[PDB]
């Protein structure tokens, strides 16, 4: 195997395929990238057994077919450490892969290309295309609400649901939920799959082409995304993902609307004197007025008063301020709307000027 490619054509591919690598896995081969040269193309693959990232790099300079695997981090660092415009020649020599650029020479230890773990073959059942910006919005709007290491595995990811001409994402950790729906102009069959948490992040990270098209293929147990010259594939998470419609407040009798920035900064300051681990803050709503209070074990207190548009009975309701701030930070808008019922029930929050995304946060008993 042999090839010579410009540094600038190898940097992004190497960075992207190294994505699924933990950087310190308990398996040497998983710390390597599979390099394959065939028919004028250099293919680079990185994997963590659950998902894989493949990059294809056209080879315009002479090359020879073959394959091997080399340490991902070292190879990337070497390529990025070379000068701008550098030509990188690579030549496989058994248990070592040589790299040369100018008078910079390197020898990396290899592992058989046959030893590289590849996901099993599968069949696509549904596929659609959309702007990378759209997929990116869908993920960024809800990813922060995914669970991390919940025993309820299906929560450690994001639901991707197609319905009508819309693609929707839902994420929740049992305490809060985020849902976003966007139309894509293609009649789609009703379907839903759960993408693993790590897979969601890797997908979000490969989106940078703005209006450049993204191709999605969903199988019974896998999802695949074609982004330019990158192909991301991940296994799916089994389980029944909850129905967001069931947590949305019913017949909200209390409604609040206020500037997003002022609301966010008030919660931010109040948070300073909230319990460091429980982060509880109290909200008191009355005619056109919101009062936010916080106190910690040292008996310190914070109080913020804001002019707001509020209709409904006066009420006190508690919240984990971090959950509230997460929502306000995810909303990049002028005004926010909140719909409530009672002190221990769901509260829905959204951009007062858009219904494309909605957030539900469960209060705390304070």
């Amino acid at each position: 195997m042999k090839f010579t490619v410009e540094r600038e054509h190898l940097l992004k591919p190497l960075q992207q395929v190294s994505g699924p690598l933990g950087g310190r896995p308990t398996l040497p081969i998983l710390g390597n990238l599979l390099l394959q040269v065939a028919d004028g193309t250099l293919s680079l693959t990185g994997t963590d057994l659950e998902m894989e990232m493949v990059a294809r790099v056209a080879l315009v300079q002479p090359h020879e077919p073959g394959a091997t695997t080399v340490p991902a981090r070292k190879f990337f660092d070497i390529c990025r450490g070379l000068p701008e415009g550098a030509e990188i020649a690579v030549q496989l020599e058994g248990e070592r892969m040589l790299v040369r650029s100018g008078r910079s020479r390197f020898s990396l230890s290899t592992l058989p290309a046959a030893d590289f773990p590849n996901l099993d073959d599968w069949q696509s059942e549904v596929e659609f295309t959309l702007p990378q910006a759209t997929m990116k919005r869908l993920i960024e709007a809800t990813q922060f609400s995914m669970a991390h290491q919940d025993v309820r595995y299906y929560l450690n990811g994001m639901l991707f649901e197609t319905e009508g001409e819309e693609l929707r994402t839902v994420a929740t950790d049992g305490h809060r939920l985020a849902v976003c729906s966007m139309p894509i102009g293609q009649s789609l069959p009703s379907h839903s799959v759960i993408v693993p948490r790590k897979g969601v992040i890797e997908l979000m990270r490969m989106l940078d082409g703005g209006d450049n098209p993204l191709r999605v293929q969903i199988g019974s147990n896998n999802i695949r995304a074609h982004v330019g010259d990158f192909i991301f594939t991940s296994k799916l998470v089994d389980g029944r993902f909850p129905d967001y419609r069931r947590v949305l407040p019913k017949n909200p009798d209390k409604h609040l609307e206020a500037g997003c920035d002022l609301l966010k900064q008030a919660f931010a300051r109040a948070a300073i004197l909230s319990n460091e681990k429980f982060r509880g803050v109290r909200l008191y709503v009355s005619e056109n007025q919101l009062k936010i209070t916080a106190n910690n074990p040292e008996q310190e207190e914070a109080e913020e008063i804001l002019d707001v548009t509020y209709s409904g009975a006066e009420m006190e309701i508690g919240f984990n301020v971090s959950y509230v701030l997460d929502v306000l930070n995810a909303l990049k808008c002028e005004n926010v709307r909140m719909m409530l019922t009672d002190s221990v029930s769901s509260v829905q929050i959204e951009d007062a000027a858009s219904q494309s995304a909605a957030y539900v946060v469960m209060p705390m008993r304070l």
Partner: peptide, 9 residues
């Protein structure tokens, strides 16, 4: 519980 859990019914 101090933090109320979402009720998916």
């Amino acid at each position: 519980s101090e933090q109320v859990e979402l009720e998916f019914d």
